[PDB]
Amino acid sequence: SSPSEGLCPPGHHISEDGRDCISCKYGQDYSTHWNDLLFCLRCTRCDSGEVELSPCTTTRNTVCQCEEGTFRPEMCRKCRTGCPRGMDCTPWSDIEC
């Protein structure tokens, strides 16, 4: 409700006047940190290659995880099948050689 030290708590953006802490809309937008912002940031939406590991809350943005057979901040890449000479694919890392 009330802006502590000019700032609103996580999951809130301060009102236009400066007196109120409006809450972020769950599913729509979020804020992660103590802030005096005019809006909450909109949730990330998942691309094709991806699934929604954690849905977007008010304190947390959405985690999209690359699907089975790929990895990642712009598009999911196909994993390197083999290693180069003289040298496991996850949803966030290539193969390590």
């Epitope: 599913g27 729509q28 949730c43 939406r45 998942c46 691309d47 094709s48 290659g49 991806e50 699934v51 929604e52 849905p55 977007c56 959405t62 690359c66 699907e67 089975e68 057979g69 790929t70 598009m75 999911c76 890449r77 196909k78």
Partner: antibody
Framework: EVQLVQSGGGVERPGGSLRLSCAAS????????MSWVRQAPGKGLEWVSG????????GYADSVKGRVTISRDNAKNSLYLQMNSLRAEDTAVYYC??????????????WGKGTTVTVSS | SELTQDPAVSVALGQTVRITCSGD??????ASWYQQKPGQAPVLVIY???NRPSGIPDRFSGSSSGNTASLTITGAQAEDEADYYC???????????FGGGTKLTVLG
């Protein structure tokens, strides 16, 4: 540029079997995910099944789950959909479609000419 | 599951039209649009964010607020009287889902 040849416009009695085959040329095939997506006479598109670049991920629409099966032979740049125990509601045109990424997905950047399948009692 | 788009809309040649596609999973999965001229293979128009494959006109534009995606044609020409569908993943992430399609007529 990409090319996709479907084939085998089949007339089949209910409870019968088909094997839709799609071949693809003009792009690396094993780099990309695939999917079948259909459409009955003048009545909206409907996603059938999806496959991963490698062949691991395989997705099937409730309306077909267990009845059809999906598989690719990256050695022959081919992608199949075996059908088993057809339904009169499986009367559709079937488009094999290239999904844009390597992972199983919903952005079909290319669409074959599509094979017609008719199921009548 | 099921994202519902109006079955029929219209535009006067040279005007703008927005075809909206609505479904409680478009809150957490980017949209994607196709075009289907009577008896052609659907042709991908706008995949997610707002990026368009090489070869489709500038005129076209995808957008998203809340649980609605919206395809937008500016200055709709004669060669746009076609069916436009939308799709995302379902509520979970495993299935795909298509909009009931919109018959966009261009007013001749």
């Amino acid at each position: 540029e990409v090319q996709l040849v479907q084939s085998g416009g089949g007339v089949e009695r209910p409870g019968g079997s088909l094997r839709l085959s799609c071949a693809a040329s003009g792009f690396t095939f094993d780099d990309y995910a695939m999917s079948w997506v259909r459409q009955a006479p003048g009545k909206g598109l409907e996603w059938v099944s999806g496959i991963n670049w490698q062949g691991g991920s395989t997705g099937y629409a409730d309306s077909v789950k267990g009845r059809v099966t999906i598989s690719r032979d990256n050695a022959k740049n081919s992608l199949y959909l075996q059908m088993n125990s057809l339904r009169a509601e499986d009367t559709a045109v079937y488009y094999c479609a290239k999904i844009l990424g390597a992972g199983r997905g919903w952005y079909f950047d290319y669409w074959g000419k599509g094979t017609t399948v008719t199921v009548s009692s | 599951s099921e994202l519902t788009q109006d079955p029929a809309v219209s535009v006067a040649l040279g005007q703008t039209v927005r075809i909206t596609c609505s479904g409680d999973s478009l809150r957490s999965y980017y949209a994607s649009w196709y075009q289907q001229k009577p008896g052609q293979a659907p042709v991908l128009v706008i995949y997610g964010a707002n990026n368009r494959p090489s070869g489709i006109p500038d005129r076209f534009s995808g957008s998203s607020s809340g649980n609605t995606a919206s395809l937008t044609i500016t200055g709709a020409q004669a060669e746009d009287e076609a069916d436009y569908y939308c799709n995302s993943a379902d509520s979970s992430g495993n299935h795909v889902v298509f909009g009931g399609g919109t018959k966009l007529t261009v007013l001749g």
